[PDB]
From Swiss-Prot, chain A:
Record gene name: PRE10
GO CC aspect terms: nucleus; proteasome complex; proteasome core complex, alpha-subunit complex; proteasome storage granule
GO molecular function, one term: mRNA binding
Other remarks on this protein: Present with 12000 molecules/cell in log phase SD medium.
Subunit structure of this chain's protein: The 26S proteasome consists of a 20S proteasome core and two 19S regulatory subunits. The 20S proteasome core is composed of 28 subunits that are arranged in four stacked rings, resulting in a barrel-shaped structure. The two end rings are each formed by seven alpha subunits, and the two central rings are each formed by seven beta subunits. The catalytic chamber with the active sites is on the inside of the barrel.
Gene source species: Saccharomyces cerevisiae (strain ATCC 204508 / S288c)
Lineage of source species: Eukaryota, Fungi, Dikarya, Ascomycota, Saccharomycotina
Name of the protein described by the UniProt record: Probable proteasome subunit alpha type-7
Gene Ontology terms: biological process: proteasomal ubiquitin-independent protein catabolic process; proteasome-mediated ubiquitin-dependent protein catabolic process
Chief location: cytoplasm
Family per record: Belongs to the peptidase T1A family.
Coverage span on the entire protein: 6 to 248 of 288
Superkingdom of origin organism: Eukaryota
From Swiss-Prot, chain F:
Entry's transmembrane regions: none
Family stated for the protein in its record: Belongs to the peptidase T1A family.
Protein name: Proteasome subunit alpha type-5
UniProt-listed SUPFAM superfamilies: N-terminal nucleophile aminohydrolases (Ntn hydrolases) (SSF56235)
Protein localization: Cytoplasm; Nucleus
Entry-linked CDD domains: proteasome_alpha_type_5 (cd03753)
Residues modified to Phosphothreonine: T47
Organism: Saccharomyces cerevisiae (strain ATCC 204508 / S288c) (Baker's yeast)
Residue positions where Phosphoserine is found in the record: S48
Swiss-Prot record, chain G:
Name used for this protein in its record: Proteasome subunit alpha type-6
GO cellular component: nucleus; proteasome complex; proteasome core complex, alpha-subunit complex; proteasome storage granule
Family: Belongs to the peptidase T1A family.
SMART domains found in the cross-reference section: Proteasome_A_N
Cross-link Glycyl lysine isopeptide (Lys-Gly) (interchain with G-Cter in ubiquitin) mapped to chain: K188
Curated annotation (Swiss-Prot), chain I:
Segments forming a coiled coil: none
GO biological process: proteasomal ubiquitin-independent protein catabolic process; proteasome-mediated ubiquitin-dependent protein catabolic process
Name of the protein described by the UniProt record: Proteasome subunit alpha type-1
Cross-link for Glycyl lysine isopeptide (Lys-Gly) (interchain with G-Cter in ubiquitin), residue positions: K222
Gene: SCL1
UniProt subcellular location: Cytoplasm; Nucleus
Organism: Saccharomyces cerevisiae (strain ATCC 204508 / S288c) (Baker's yeast)
């Protein structure tokens, strides 16, 4: 034993226990989700209200990369911010050299290679976040989810954090009941519902809902936050479904 | 580069590497320094476990840093060469930038600073060496004798000893050396230095080295026969 | 990141042993047998092509390697370590010699350079020793034919004949009885094949044996004509057919 | 400083060096000693660009003094001259070369022979019976070619040196304010205070 | 991080010893014995090759005795590969000195340089020390014939006669017994071989298990010659001295 | 082993806490601040009678308006003093004025936590920095290897520190004269010292606006010791 | 236990113990309170002394004319982080002629602290910070933890016994947020808040430290007899 | 060839009274024979009761003033809000200017 | 026992970190196969999409390294992509420097040399992957070269990698023992793919749908992967005889 004391050490299983321990920090975090719709993607996250003293709508968690990519994560919030800062550098240098905005699959690998690099040495700690991200490019909508190991795949729907099982079950229903697809405005409504349903795992403290979206028709392929009437409409739809 | 912090504090507030460096000094051959009224004498032990030695070419224990300053030591021999070289370079660097030779105090302060630096620098261990630095400042007839140690602390001494069985010879010096009246001549100063080493040395043959430093860059090393005459006279007075 | 292993991984133990070198020698012991014999008019080096799978094409894996036109090498131990050493040995022959003197290095000096590289992996920071022992055969004008062994420590010794790896102890005894100072190259090849048969279990033919010689100049292998002083490489790898021909007179 | 001479006689080396230092159109000093003792039996005179001369000389002096202390031994004049040459040959291809010409007069205690080395700022070394730098040789070498013997005494060497200085004082346009003369022999280095 | 795996090669023991230096010396004590004897008219270097084979090419072999320049040579005891690293450095230092001062390097200055390199590996860098002890045999016009030794600690000392490697305790006693100051080279040759013959772990001392060298002013008039003995010449001197 | 910049479970840096233990072994140093000046005094503690005590320099001048006393591994203080003197003179170069005592102290303390795997370990010495400037008058600071510095009306550091600090608690008031402070340092030093206090094994110093930083002669201190003995025998 | 030797090591439950130990240093530190209305933002800090002869350690640091913080934990670490803020505020002014937004200042502190938690050799910061400021979107209050977590709040407190002041602010939320255009009453509410964290000791003239920033009020610190008004 | 320097003209005047001081300057900014601006401030309040004007090449002038203003700000941070005296500001400016001894601020400055 | 944590020798002369990297290779539980035709080289690999939420089009362990070279990986995807990106960079750099397309066996050697370095240098860990490179080389023809974490590489007539590699290996061995040739004697690549799938079915004893497989084909001057519908056409032909 001692194989779990140092990062980048293979156990006799062929496992990197330090990465597996990073996953535990992700599982400890708040629930975040992603839904791929007809011409875009929707992101949503659970924000735990620790105290009345928290200013509503101020501590924003979802982050934009470039102008067409949205990123949300569960786990160690600072680690997620660090990963997005890198993502923004990667997207900038891509656009600098190649002119066009970075494609989503291209962007996914840039994050993937960076996170994977933090599993190669004992001088660095793996990332304590699973990141759900995506957007709209020339080939259409893409949704991805990236783990501490550097592993990522494309998704129809994605979920991570403490209420991930509950969320995953809800996403699987949507995939089955909508083979033709889901509209962007529907996806926002459904996203709200799923976060509310996933809140049963964090039921001690009440929470604040935060949603964002990129859609070719609804937002011109740009990342935007869901605000005001459209946010309230989604909250009402969510509250109606839990009762 | 290798950056590892080797010299570090322990729970009881000790830097063990610096303290273990002092143990290397304890192992080294005895060295003694005595300052008279118009001179300083540096005595050094030579362990007689090594015969078939070529004494012409074997590194001598007392080293000239400049024409007016000398340095003897106890501890690791290889370590002492590095300090001596740095000191010799600094001595010429001082003459070059300030147009005066170093004072004995300044040279000591430099060597002590080097030793200290090696107690809080990454990747390096402390020097396993304590030094006795002696001489006369330019255009000054007051004798100077200083001591340094691995930690980097230094101080001036009327008389001092370092190395193995230094506890015994310091005992001798403390009762035999009078501050109100120090050894007035060269003879008296050398005699007291040889006497102090005879408490520890074994045979008074090729085991004792003596170096006399007088004012105005007057430095000479005594030969075997000259020292042997002191050894003879001391024991003949002792038979009484 | 940064390589933060700036300290030695090979150190003296209380008994005076360098553990990692000893262990590297143990890895060499497990390795497949290879040998070298020196004749009056040439040198031969040989080893078994231990194929990992019958689906693998063992011709693509070269255990015997040309270092210069007149110098060849073979190993026992870890193959990947050997491969990178051959790459470095070929390059160092140019950088530290040919690009200076305009000619290929003599056997002993190239060996010296390979040895240096192996010694540095025994002392430098954050690296293990190479897990191979090399046998280097070669010829040069002023020293004639020669054969050298190079160990993980970087130590190298000249041999009349020797063997390394799995069945080295038995093979060295076999060579002591057969070797003399009047051997012709063909006689040395014959002895090499006899010696190598003892350590091989399975098939013993041109396709499972890899054998090269340092002998006469091969103008047919030079690739060009017109310069009298250039007469071609002395290193030549024996074909599968050439080996089998000598196995009938065995 | 422009003028430095050297002559090797039977048992000593004699170096003569001007006393003048000029800034702009004004002579600032008429008693300047353009020489440094490198070791007890080795003297180096110098001439070249302002500043570089003293900085180089003192730098060499420091290095030879360091060697002496380290080994408790005096380097031969030949060894010192080779060290000096290498420093100048190194210097000439630097970003900003040291523009200094030197004469090295030493007495080799091993061979019991005086030795005179002439080295210019490029690192061009030659051992000579007599030497000079700049234009000094143009005026003086014809006299030295005529009068010089290898068995000359120190007193004869000084007389021939006086004749050289007189010729310089007659035919040179520049007033160099006389010379400081120094003798290097088996007993070391001493200055001739009346010349 | 990486700290976990650091052996810390440059630290003191509680007793004030350098662990790695002491263990390196333990390694050297198993190496073949090398002897140096200094006489009035020259120096002898004798050394024992370690358990050889009949198939080792001896005439082109060199593991013990190495030439640093025309005036200085060394006998090796320890890791040969380590020694060659240092030897090439020493050869370069000699040539640097010659280029700078246009004079052959004094023996002690070369020795001090190599010993300072060894010292550095015990105080900084975190690397293992060189597992080598040298005997330096050399000549210059200041001190004449000189013998020195250096060990992994970087400490060096001068000698009239000295041994390194295996059985130095026994060897040093035998040398101390028969050595005299007015001794000559031919006598020293005999002493060196007799000492090896008694201290050797082998059954008998033969030509194929020895390397031998002399530094003589036995060169035509005031100059010094190095002689690295050939296998046949070692065989002849063994018969001459009456060992075989 | 373990990192040099490691936190303990209590939220303290191991190495900093251990260096504080080294300072407890050091010789006693005391500082008292008054409206007439600041007094600094130290125990010399010679290890042998042959050691020329006047070469023990545990009180040091940083500038004409700033002095400094030390306790602990005194060799470590040399580079701190060098930095302090450089900072003090450099500020005078840049701004044509004396540097504030606090600003000087802050500059010294900035070195403290520059250790890791920069220097390999914290300093093993504490400093009493005393001085005067026009803005905040006479000041006394205690500079630790933690990088923290407190201002004090009076402070003791070293082996007899907690015993001396309790004594300084009772004796200090805002109307102390310089002469009263001098005797008070001598009194408390004499109380905590192993050997008997005299002019050779103890040293006094002060900083005033008029005369600046001054180390006291052995003859001057000897009289103040004699004056102390008589006033204690007076009741 | 086995996983607290350095910051580069996760525990089996996904915890970073060196970060948690740094968080502990804050709890040992003296109490400090932060609260704001729509016009002003206030810091109140209980300063700590070594003894009766010593001074009271300063707790509040100015970063710009419109921004500053209070500290709790290792004071040297607060100096390093405040110096970084001073530079960043200053870079924004010199390059963009733009006062640095308080929210962006929080994001910068977060990212600086994070780098010290993922790399070998270094250590996390051992201090907690309460940043107040007034920018183009009005008054702000931030709480910084050396884990990297930065949070925007109406009011809060950190340090020893900070839970008492935090509960008080949670009750008073609806009252003090409405204190607009009245700096003295907002400070009163802050002084009354920090009083809920006191035991044995009370607020004296050299004990109390207050800072304020607002609409037409540059960041100014009050110490000594300037706070006797509020005792 | 690129010429990094220019001349923006202008003229400034400083006079010290018994208990007051004035620093005046025209508001005209020019290049060659053209007027850039008829009102471009050239004399600035730098805080701590100090006024400055760096006349000559406006880009170097603006840069210097900007750096000194910054120097005053950091003087407050580093030395407990101490007021920067006029003599101290002067010496500080000397070091700001000599930093570019080998690529000078082409301005003539007065405070 | 720190000789098991970093890449240094154990007393037995073993590198345990290398051996454990081999074990990580089978973590995906996927089996791959490669065979050579007359004009082509075919590689097939199992495809497993366990989660319904996944976009199955993005789940792949076959990579297009250059236009001529394809690579299939056995091991975790992060290391797989790490190796893929590096191989793509190396292939492009080779073309730029030396003026011709990097051969399959040369790239294999280069990646193997990189793998060797990780086994010798302590600060770098081995990648837990086995890389199978395929092409139709302009000099050597149809080519299969495979690299592992030990830094070992060799050419192959055919090969198989994964948990059940031995079953597939023996199945292929037995076929080539009959035919007595080093390749699949077939004109079209379509039939060589059908051979590859058929013999994987026989060896593993499992049937495949279009979504259970992943196929890569190398021809002269291009390497390409097959779509689900291309594979379906292949599966239909197999069933109809
Ligand atoms: Cl390569």
């Amino acid at each position: 034993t001692g194989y779990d004391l140092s990062n980048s050490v293979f156990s006799p299983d062929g496992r990197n226990f330090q990465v597996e321990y990073a996953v535990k920090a992700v599982e400890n975090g708040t629930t975040s989700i992603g839904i791929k719709c007809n011409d875009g993607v929707v992101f949503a996250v659970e924000k735990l209200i620790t105290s009345k003293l928290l200013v509503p709508q101020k501590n924003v968690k979802i982050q934009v990369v470039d102008r067409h990519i949205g990123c949300v994560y569960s786990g160690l919030i600072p680690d997620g911010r660090h990963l997005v800062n890198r993502g923004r550098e990667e997207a900038a240098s891509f656009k600098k050299l190649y002119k066009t905005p970075i494609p989503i699959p291209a962007f996914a690998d840039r994050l993937g290679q960076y996170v994977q690099a933090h599993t190669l040495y004992n001088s660095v700690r793996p990332f304590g976040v699973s990141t759900i991200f995506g957007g709209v490019d020339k080939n259409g909508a893409h949704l991805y989810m990236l783990e501490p190991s550097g592993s990522y795949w494309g998704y129809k729907g994605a979920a991570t954090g403490k209420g991930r099982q509950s969320a995953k079950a809800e996403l699987e229903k949507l995939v089955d009941h909508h083979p033709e697809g889901l509209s962007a405005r529907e996806a926002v409504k459904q996203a709200a519902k799923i976060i509310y349903l996933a809140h049963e795992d964090n039921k001690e403290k009440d929470f604040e809902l935060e949603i964002s979206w990129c859609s070719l028709s609804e937002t011109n392929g740009l990342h935007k936050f869901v605000k005001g009437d459209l946010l309230q409409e989604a909250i009402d739809f969510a509250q109606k479904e839990i009762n | 580069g290798y950056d590892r912090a080797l010299s570090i504090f322990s729970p009881d507030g000790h830097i063990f590497q610096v303290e273990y460096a002092l143990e290397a000094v304890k192992r080294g051959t005895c060295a003694v320094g005595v300052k008279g009224k118009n001179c300083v004498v540096l005595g050094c032990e030579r362990r007689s476990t090594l015969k078939l030695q070529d004494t012409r070419i074997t590194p001598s224990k007392v080293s000239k840093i400049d024409s007016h300053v000398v340095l003897s030591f106890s501890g690791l021999n290889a370590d002492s060469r590095i300090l001596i070289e740095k000191a010799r370079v600094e001595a010429q660097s001082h003459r070059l930038t300030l147009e005066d030779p170093v004072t004995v105090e300044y040279l000591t302060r430099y060597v002590a600073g080097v030793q200290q630096r090696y107690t809080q620098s990454g990747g390096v261990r402390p020097f396993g060496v304590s030094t006795l630095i002696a001489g006369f400042d330019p255009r000054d007839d007051e004798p100077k004798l200083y001591q340094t140690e691995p930690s980097g602390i230094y101080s001036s001494w009327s008389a001092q000893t370092i190395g193995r069985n230094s506890k015994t010879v310091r005992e001798f010096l403390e009762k035999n050396y009078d501050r109100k009246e120090p050894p007035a001549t060269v003879e008296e100063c050398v005699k007291l230095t040889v006497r102090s080493l005879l408490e520890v040395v074994q045979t008074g043959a090729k085991n004792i080295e003596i170096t006399v430093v007088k004012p105005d860059s007057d430095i000479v090393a005594l030969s075997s026969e000259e020292i042997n005459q002191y050894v003879t006279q001391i024991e003949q007075e002792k038979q009484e | 990141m940064t390589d933060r292993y700036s300290f030695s991984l090979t150190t003296f133990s209380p008994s005076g042993k360098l553990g990692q070198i000893d262990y590297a020698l143990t890895a060499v012991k497990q390795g497949v047998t290879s040998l070298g014999i020196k004749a009056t008019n040439g040198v031969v080096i040989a080893t078994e092509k231990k194929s990992s799978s019958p689906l693998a094409m063992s011709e693509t894996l070269s255990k015997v390697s040309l270092l210069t036109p007149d110098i060849g090498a073979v190993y026992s131990g870890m193959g990947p370590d050997y491969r990178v050493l051959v790459d470095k040995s070929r390059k160092v022959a140019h950088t530290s010699y040919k690009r200076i003197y305009g000619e290929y290095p003599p056997t002993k000096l190239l060996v010296s350079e390979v040895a240096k590289i192996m010694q540095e992996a025994t002392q430098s920071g954050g690296v293990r020793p190479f897990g191979v022992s090399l046998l280097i055969a070669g010829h040069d004008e002023f020293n004639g034919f020669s054969l050298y062994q190079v160990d993980p420590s970087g130590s190298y010794f000249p041999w009349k004949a020797t063997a390394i790896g799995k069945g080295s102890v038995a093979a060295k005894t076999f060579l002591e009885k057969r070797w003399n100072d009047e051997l012709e190259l063909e006689d040395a090849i014959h002895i090499a094949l006899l010696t190598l048969k003892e350590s091989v279990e399975g098939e013993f033919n041109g396709d499972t044996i890899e054998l090269a010689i340092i002998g006469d100049e091969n103008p047919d292998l030079l690739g060009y004509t017109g310069i009298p002083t250039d007469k071609g490489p002395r290193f030549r790898k024996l074909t599968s057919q050439e080996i089998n021909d000598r196995l009938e007179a065995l | 400083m422009d003028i430095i001479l050297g002559i090797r006689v039977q048992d000593s080396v004699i170096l003569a060096s001007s006393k003048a230092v000029t800034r702009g159109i004004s002579v600032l000093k008429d008693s300047d000693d353009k020489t440094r003792q490198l070791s007890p039996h080795t003297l180096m005179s110098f001439a070249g660009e302002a500043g570089d001369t003293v900085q180089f000389a003192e730098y060499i002096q420091a290095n030879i003094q360091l060697y002496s202390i380290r080994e408790d031994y005096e380097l031969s004049p030949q060894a010192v001259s080779s060290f000096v040459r290498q420093e100048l040959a190194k210097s000439i291809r630097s970003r900003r070369p040291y523009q200094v010409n030197v004469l090295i007069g030493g007495y080799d205690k091993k061979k019991n022979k005086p030795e005179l080395y002439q080295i210019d700022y490029l690192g061009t070394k030659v051992e000579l019976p007599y030497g000079a730098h700049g234009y000094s040789g143009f005026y003086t070498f014809s006299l030295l070619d005529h009068h010089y013997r290898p068995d000359m005494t120190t007193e004869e060497g000084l007389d021939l040196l006086k004749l050289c200085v007189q010729e310089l004082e007659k035919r040179m346009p520049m007033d160099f304010k006389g010379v400081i003369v120094k003798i290097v022999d088996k007993d070391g280095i001493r200055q001739v205070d009346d010349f | 991080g990486s700290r976990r795996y650091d052996s810390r090669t440059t630290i003191f023991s509680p007793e004030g010893r350098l662990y790695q230096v002491e263990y390196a010396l333990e390694s050297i004590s198993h190496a073949g014995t090398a002897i140096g004897i200094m006489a009035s008219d020259g120096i002898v270097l004798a050394a024992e090759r370690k358990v050889t084979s009949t198939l080792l090419e001896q005439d082109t072999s060199t593991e013990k005795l190495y030439k640093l320049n025309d005036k200085i040579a060394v006998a090796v005891a320890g890791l040969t590969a380590d020694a060659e690293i240092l030897i090439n450095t020493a050869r370069i230092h000699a040539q640097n000195y010659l280029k700078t001062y246009n004079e052959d390097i004094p023996v002690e200055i070369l020795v001090r340089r190599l010993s300072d390199i060894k010292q550095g590996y015990t105080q900084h860098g975190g690397l293992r020390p060189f597992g080598v002890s040298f005997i330096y045999a050399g000549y210059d016009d200041r001190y004449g014939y000189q013998l020195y030794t250096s060990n992994p600690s970087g400490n060096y000392t001068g000698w009239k006669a000295i041994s390194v490697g295996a059985n130095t305790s026994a060897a040093q006693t035998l040398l101390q017994m028969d050595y005299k100051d007015d001794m000559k080279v031919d006598d020293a040759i005999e002493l060196a071989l007799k000492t090896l013959s008694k201290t050797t772990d082998s059954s008998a001392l033969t030509y194929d298990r020895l390397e031998f060298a002399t530094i003589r002013k036995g060169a035509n008039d005031g100059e010094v010659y190095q002689k690295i003995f050939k296998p046949q010449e070692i065989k002849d001197i063994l018969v001459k001295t009456g060992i075989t | 082993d373990r990192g040099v910049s490691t936190f303990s479970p209590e939220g303290r840096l191991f190495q900093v806490e251990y260096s504080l233990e080294a300072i407890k072994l050091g010789s006693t140093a005391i500082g008292i601040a008054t409206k007439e000046g600041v007094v600094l005094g130290v125990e010399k503690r010679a290890t042998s009678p042959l050691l020329e005590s006047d070469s023990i320099e545990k009180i040091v001048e940083i500038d004409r308006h700033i002095g400094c006393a030390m306790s602990g591994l005194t060799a470590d203080a040399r580079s701190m003093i060098e930095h302090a003197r450089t900072a003090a003179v450099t500020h005078n170069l840049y701004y044509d004025e004396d540097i504030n005592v606090e600003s000087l102290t802050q500059s010294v303390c900035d070195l403290a936590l520059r250790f890791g795997e920069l220097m390999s370990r914290p300093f093993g010495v504490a400093l009493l920095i005393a001085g005067h400037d026009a803005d905040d008058g006479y000041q006394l600071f205690h500079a630790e290897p933690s990088g923290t510095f407190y201002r004090y009306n009076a402070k003791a550091i070293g082996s007899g520190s907690e015993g001396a600090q309790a004594e300084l608690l009772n004796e200090w008031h805002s109307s102390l004269t310089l002469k009263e402070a001098e005797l008070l340092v001598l009194k408390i030093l004499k109380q905590v010292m192993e050997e008997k206090l005299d002019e050779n094994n103890a040293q006094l110093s002060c900083i005033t606006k008029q005369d600046g930083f001054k180390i006291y002669d052995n003859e001057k201190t000897a009289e103040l010791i004699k004056e102390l003995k008589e006033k204690e025998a007076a009741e | 236990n086995n996983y607290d030797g350095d910051t580069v090591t996760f525990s089996p439950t996904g915890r970073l113990f060196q970060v948690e130990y740094a968080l502990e240093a804050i709890k040992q530190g003296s109490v400090t309170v932060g609260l704001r209305s729509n016009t002003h933002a206030v810091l109140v800090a209980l300063k700590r002394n070594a003894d009766e002869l010593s001074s009271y350690q300063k707790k509040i640091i100015k970063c710009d004319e419109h921004m500053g913080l209070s500290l709790a934990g290792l004071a040297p670490d607060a100096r390093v982080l405040s110096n970084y803020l001073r530079q960043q505020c200053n870079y924004s002014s010199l390059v963009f002629n733009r006062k640095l937004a308080v929210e962006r200042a929080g994001h910068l502190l977060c990212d600086k602290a994070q780098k010290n938690t993922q790399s070998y050799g270094g250590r996390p910061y051992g201090v907690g910070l309460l940043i107040i400021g007034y920018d183009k979107s009005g008054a702000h209050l931030l709480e910084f933890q050396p884990s990297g977590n930065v949070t925007e709040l109406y009011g809060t407190a950190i340090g020893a016994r900070s839970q008492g002041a935090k509960t008080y602010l949670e009750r008073t939320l609806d009252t003090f947020i409405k204190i607009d255009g009245n700096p003295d009453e907002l400070i009163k509410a802050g002084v009354e808040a920090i009083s809920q964290s006191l035991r044995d000791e009370s607020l004296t003239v050299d004990n109390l430290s207050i800072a304020i920033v607002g609409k037409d009020t540059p960041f100014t610190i009050y110490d000594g007899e300037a706070v006797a008004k509020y005792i | 060839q690129f010429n990094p320097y220019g001349d923006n003209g202008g003229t400034i005047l400083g006079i010290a009274g018994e208990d007051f001081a004035v620093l005046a300057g025209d508001t005209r900014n020019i290049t060659d024979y053209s007027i850039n601006s008829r009102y471009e401030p050239k004399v600035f309040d730098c805080g701590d009761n100090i006024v400055m004007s760096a006349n000559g090449f406006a880009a170097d002038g603006d840069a210097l003033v900007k750096r000194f203003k910054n120097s005053v700000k950091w003087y407050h941070f580093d030395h407990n809000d101490k007021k920067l005296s006029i003599n101290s500001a002067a010496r500080n400016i000397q070091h700001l200017l000599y930093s570019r001894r080998f690529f000078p601020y082409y301005v003539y400055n007065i405070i | 026992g720190y000789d098991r944590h970093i890449t240094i020798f154990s007393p037995e002369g073993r590198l345990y970190q290398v051996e454990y990297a081999f074990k990580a290779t089978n973590q995906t539980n996927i089996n791959s196969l490669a065979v050579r035709g007359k004009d082509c080289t075919v590689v097939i690999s199992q495809k497993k999409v366990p989660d319904k939420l996944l976009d199955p089009t993005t789940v792949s362990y076959i990579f297009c390294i250059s236009r001529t070279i394809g690579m299939v990986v056995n091991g975790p995807i992060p290391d797989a992509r790490n190796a893929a990106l590096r191989a793509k960079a190396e292939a492009a750099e080779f073309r730029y420097k030396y003026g011709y397309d990097m051969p399959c066996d040369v790239l294999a050697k280069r990646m193997a040399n990189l793998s060797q370095i990780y086994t010798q240098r302590a600060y770098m860990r081995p990648l837990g992957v086995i890389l199978t490179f395929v092409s139709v080389d302009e000099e050597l023809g149809p080519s299969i070269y495979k690299t592992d974490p030990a830094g070992y590489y060799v050419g192959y007539k055919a090969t198989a990698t994964g948990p059940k590699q031995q079953e597939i290996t023996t199945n292929l061995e037995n076929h080539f023992k009959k035919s007595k040739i080093d390749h699949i004697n077939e004109e079209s690549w379509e039939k060589v793919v059908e051979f590859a799938i058929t013999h994987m079915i026989d060896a593993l004893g499992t049937e495949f749908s279009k979504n259970d497989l992943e196929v890569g084909v190398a021809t002269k001057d291009k390497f390409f992967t097959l779509s689900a519908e291309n594979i379906e056409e292949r599966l239909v032909a197999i069933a109809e005889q």
